[PDB]
Write a protein that binds this ligand. Sequence first.
Ligand SMILES: Nc1ncnc2c1ncn2[C@@H]1O[C@H](COP(=O)(O)OP(=O)(O)NP(=O)(O)O)[C@@H](O)[C@H]1O
Ligand SMILES: [Zn+2]
Length: 250
Amino acid sequence: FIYNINIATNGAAKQLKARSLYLDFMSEYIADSLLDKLGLNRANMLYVGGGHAYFVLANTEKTVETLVQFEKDFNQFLLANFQTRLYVAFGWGSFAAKDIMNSPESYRQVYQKASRMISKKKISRYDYQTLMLLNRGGKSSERECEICHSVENLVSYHDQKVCDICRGLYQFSKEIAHDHFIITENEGLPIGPNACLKGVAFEKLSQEAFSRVYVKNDYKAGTVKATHVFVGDYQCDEIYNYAALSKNEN
RNA sequence: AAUGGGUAAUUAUAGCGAGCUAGAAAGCCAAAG
Ligand SMILES: Nc1ncnc2c1ncn2[C@@H]1O[C@H](COP(=O)(O)OP(=O)(O)NP(=O)(O)O)[C@@H](O)[C@H]1O
Ligand SMILES: [Zn+2]
């Protein structure tokens, strides 16, 4: 999805910066919104990274059914507007107080129990109804999104035929430089079930109406009382100057 | 003494054996959007 960019693409690297940043907010938000379908918060998440995020949850039935139902919810969201290019696969290993110095073959042997369930669910993706609804036919499409070859919701953003996600990514590339990224319900790129992402300035938080706010690269607590993400980014200049600034002063 | 004749050595020696500048640019594309 990220290196779907090719030769003769409208976006140079803003369509690549804003695309590898967007999936990282999606990986952040799956981790966040999974923890309030449960009763938990950010402490229980051991790590979040490039789509991978390890947790510590409770070995009980009301959590496992919440895991399965939220997994089906987010995969319905990914099928609604990414069409089997993105698939999130949960997986959970039950363990006692065995991550404590049967000392060698107890810790990693249950950390790998979740990776086996992921590899089993990554390999047998869907079920009956959600694949019969896939290849149901019924579409007289003439055109397609020339970035990702999708069909639904075609617009003419800068006289090229692009889709709903790949116009939201240009809008997010105009909004990428901000520190604050809020989740609304109907604005910008969708990142979940009834949950969309929008980049916002600081003093526009009273104008906008959100539910959860992320602040990027900040250790001060701030005013919005946000969730602190940390994405590495830097821009000294635009890309086309990087050859011309390759000279010395002489 | 005349008379017959020439015979030996060197066949090039000492050097420099290339130096410096340029080492791909400008367009299409990409950017500008
Ligand atoms: N948002 C992102 N932007 C840029 N690079 C990323 C991002 N997320 C992950 N990556 C990179 O992608 C790597 C993982 O690639 P990938 O093969 O997709 O792993 P995966 O999540 O297991 N997908 P798959 O290989 O199909 O199972 C990471 O190690 C990162 O280097
Ligand atoms: Zn697209």
